[PDB]
Amino acid sequence: LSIEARLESIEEKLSMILGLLRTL
Amino acid sequence: SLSIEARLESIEEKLSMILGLLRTLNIA
Amino acid sequence: SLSIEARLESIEEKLSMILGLLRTLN
Amino acid sequence: LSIEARLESIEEKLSMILGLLRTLN
């Protein structure tokens, strides 16, 4: 995967993590 | 087709929010 | 020191560990 | 900051996040 695609995936995982933490 | 620097800026903002929220959750 | 790709690999593994802990919290 | 320095800082923040999650559990 390109660096750009990898960073996009990292951003998506961070969005998920943040969403889960906000429900606590 | 976002630039790498713009993607890093978004990642950095999300990390900052995650850290602030986790510290808040850890308050006794 | 680390190449950009090696740093990304480390970041990706830490994210997997974080997500794994979130599903098993409490 | 260079991209390499920004990624190093991101990695450090992720390590801190892991520590905070471990304490929370």
Author numbering:
A (entry chain D): 170 to 193
B (entry chain C): 169 to 196
C (entry chain A): 169 to 194
D (entry chain B): 170 to 194
Paper text:
Although we were not able to grow crystals of a complex, crystals which later proved to harbour only the P oligomerization region could be obtained after extended time periods. Serendipitously, we obtained two additional crystal forms of Pcore with improved resolution, allowing us to build a higher quality model (100% Ramachandran favoured). The first crystal (form 1, space group P21) diffracted to a resolution of 1.6 Å, while the second crystal (form 2, space group P212121) gave rise to diffraction data up to 2.2 Å. The P21 crystal (form 1) of HMPV Pcore grew at 20 °C after 291–344 days with mother liquor containing 20% polyethylene glycol (PEG) 6000, 200 mM NaCl, and 100 mM Tris, pH 8.0. Diffraction data were recorded on beamlines I03 (P21 crystal) and I04 (P212121 crystal) at Diamond Light Source, Didcot, UK. For the 1.6 Å data of crystal form 1 we additionally carried out anisotropic atomic displacement parameter (ADP) refinement. Mapping of the sequence conservation within the Pneumoviridae onto Pcore reveals the strict conservation of the hydrophobic amino acids (Leu and Ile residues) lining the interior of the coiled-coil, indicating that all family members share a similar P oligomerization region (strictly conserved residues in purple). Furthermore, Arg175 is strictly conserved in all Pneumoviridae and plays a role in stabilizing the quaternary structure of the tetramer by forming a salt bridge with either an Asp or Glu on the neighbouring helix. Alignment of all six tetramers from crystal forms 1 and 2 and the original crystal confirmed that there are small-scale breathing motions within the coiled-coil. The ability of the C-terminal region of P to stabilize this α-helical structure might explain its absence from the crystal structures of Pcore (as the P constructs used for crystallization required C-terminal degradation in order to yield diffracting crystals, which in turn destabilizes the cap-like structure).
The essential polymerase cofactor P from Pneumoviridae is a multifunctional hub which interacts with numerous components of the viral RNA-synthesis machinery. Pneumoviral P interacts with both L and the nucleocapsid, thereby tethering the polymerase to its template. In HMPV and RSV a central oligomerization domain facilitates the formation of P tetramers. In summary, we have shown that HMPV P is a highly dynamic protein that is composed of a stable helical tetramerization domain flanked by large N-terminal and C-terminal IDRs that sample a large volume in solution and display varying degrees of preformed structural elements.
